[model samples]
Target: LRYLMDPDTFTSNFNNDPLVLRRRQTYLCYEVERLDNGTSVKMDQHMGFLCNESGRHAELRFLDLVPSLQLDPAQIYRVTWFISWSPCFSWGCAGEVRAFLQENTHVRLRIKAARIYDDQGRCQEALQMLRDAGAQVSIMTYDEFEYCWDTFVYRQGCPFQPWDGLEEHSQALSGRLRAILQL
Candidate 1:
């Protein structure tokens, strides 16, 4: 299990959501699990607005569906303006998005979501980022993002984690997330 940044993991939708442009090689490796703080009992919990499986997704989690994913040991990750609440992060995710554009003219930002869960595990309105100059944009809202995740990722059987980036699956102290960082 490698570790990489997944923006969509903790993302919220904006202006609703939809797409049919580019994509990536990935895995169904980003699952949410929880452990009780008070007991020795192990409690694994997976969080998402959509928590149902078709049957094949259940099996893919057993191992890897192995279609593809993006994972790099030394990703060219760049951290920038943060929304404060997220304590949010991504090693190389937004970079991948901006790499498609010219650096002199384009910049990729790690924006906040509609509901960025705090360290205490409580949900709140979130943040998101973007630096595409003159780029036609239709930002997604938290609910919109959830709809897509369930519609495409969970229901459609697409890879969840980047296959080429060296990021690992993790649980947060308080909430269900794709994962930001351990600390």
Candidate 2:
């Protein structure tokens, strides 16, 4: 009980410090400004993706070294960072960092992939690059379809079904299903 209560005093003391308040404000501003400027893509502090440069695919990685660490108001800390990538589209890249923290919850800055893309519409090649970069997490699919006459087909816009042999409705459905699975 005493141990738990004792930490509260330190917490209150830290929270009341003017320097700490200013630092917190600075951090908050940095985060908000990054979002507003669309500079940093914040995704769960773990993962994010971006698509740019028409027909190209890019991959990026980031690391929060001291994810659970708090900033110290009194000490000035300078973090070192580095990144490396292969020139060929077939090769992958990586980044790394090294740092220490005073608190158990101290945040460590680390290097990670920032962005990756291929501008040649080589999605398969891009996927291969990603696989080489790291472990493939998961695959997903999404589809929008409508059931007509007990057969599932592309939603609304597509005209005619295969029954009349007017169009290849079965093939279309198969293609759509394949797309949804991202195959």
Candidate 3:
């Protein structure tokens, strides 16, 4: 099962509630080992918020869904979901479900639904769904300079533990992109 980040670590209100903070943190840190692979993953506990043009709205943001998790190309992953609400609600809950894949050398983004879930799990399925439904898909690769200086720095960090060898990886990825895209 995929897990989310701790609420207190990123939430403002919960940070001030000592009782809830301590109790929640303790529970959030509990680790569960996947019997299948012996991989230890935490069962995170928290709620998220959403913001729109008007103001903040109640919602959940899965920040832990990082691009690195897309490293595996063999496994087909899918997400299913739904939402409901009344029209009278001032701040309507905005719902969106999307699926994307990013290879070491490429990226593909697809929007499945506004609130409902779709069963398609493969890239071909996504393509077919969009084509059959008259939807559009967008794919973009990081430019050499921007990839190295911005995206890399933003996601992988700088010259420390989180450091991903920005300059080195950028040069490598740039060459790979050039060869693959025939740029």
**TM per candidate:** 0.21, 0.19, 0.19
Best of the two (1, 3) by TM-score? 1
Question: What tens digits encode model 3's per-residue C-alpha lDDT throughout 1-183?
Answer: 223332323232112221222322111111112222444322222111222122322222321343423434443222211111110022222222122222211222222111111223342343344333322322222232232223222323432121234344334433432333231
Query: How many steric clashes does model 1 contain?
Result: 36
Whole-model Cα lDDT of every candidate shown, in order: 0.27, 0.24, 0.25
Q: Rank the candidates by TM-score, best first.
A: 1, 3, 2
**Per-residue error (Å), model 3, residue 129:** 7.3
For residues 1-183, what per-residue lDDT tens digits would candidate 2 score against the true structure? 001112222222112111222211100000101122434333233222222233331322222323432435444333212111111233232221111222322332222211122243453354343334332312111111112111212223544222131124324433432343253
Model 3 residue 169 CA deviation (Å) reads 53
Position 124, candidate 1: lDDT = 18
Global fold similarity of model 2 (TM-score): 0.19
Lowest summed lDDT across 10 adjacent residues in model 2 is found at 24-33
User: Candidate 1 lDDT, tens digit per residue, 31-124?
Assistant: 3222235432211222112211443222122222212322122333221221212222233333333443344232222332322333432221
lDDT of 1 at 74: 35
